[PDB]
Structure 1
């Protein structure tokens, strides 16, 4: 509960996936360090949308292989993301890739009428990110470092 990095990471990732899936912006205010969270979500819309467009075939290929139909499938994706994401090197390129693939899957979840799985997917991505890359994120100045890196 006393973990600002986790709270802010979940807020950003949750909002991006939800707005990617529904096409609607969330109007609830951002709690603590609102400006940073706003700018981060703003950066994701530019860079994340970019990754999904530029790498559509690779994302569609991966989604087809994973065959997501339900909550059990979304649960097993987290195991995949740990192996895939956590075993490789650490940088904002791969972090945006992970979150962008998150958003790609979220749109699929809306397509197949499994919207209830989007919040659990966002929490699973947040947990992989902040659990496996804590020390890297803190050293990089967290979401302020993310905003500055993609300016």
Structure 2
């Protein structure tokens, strides 16, 4: 479902904004997915992210930025195709984009990034997810 993905994105972003000191007011199997994803994002940010180039310096979102610009940049996470670890990085990257947005007084962009993330997730990532056991398999691995 594309609506459960939308909830999933919103859940992750709300968690990230709260954790980092900002307002989140910008907008069971499912809870198991959200919690494992929140947890995996923290782990990635804490231990893994710094091994890579900072993808946020490739993208400066303003109210005029088009989806396609976001899409092209996120595409780099998937230069070698999709795996769960890059999917997790994808969420963290969205969260970082949102934190930076709220920080520079462009909090309106948070809901747009959310929409962008759901769109990107629904067409580029979801086919690999369904092929590789769906989100329940993610919970088995990362929960």
TM-score by length of 1: 0.75
- Deviation track 1:94-149 (CA, whole Å, cap 9, x = no partner) reads 11011111111111111112222112212212222220233321133322122112
Runs of 4+ in 1 over 3 A off after TM superposition: 22-26, 56-59
Tell me the distance in 1 between the aligned counterparts of 2:35 and 2:76. 26
| Contact persistence 1:102–1:125 (CA under 8 A) | yes
Over the aligned positions, Cα root-mean-square deviation in angstroms equals 2.5
Unmatched 5+ stretches in structure 1: 27-34
1:50 aligns with 2:4: no
Tell me the distance in 2 between the aligned counterparts of 1:36 and 1:118. 26
Tell me the distance in 2 between the aligned counterparts of 1:39 and 1:72. 36
| Contact persistence 1:102–1:121 (CA under 8 A) | yes
Aligned to 1:29: none
TM-score by length of 2: 0.78
Name the count of aligned residue pairs.
136
Q: Which of 101, 117, 125 is matched with 1:109 structurally?
A: 101
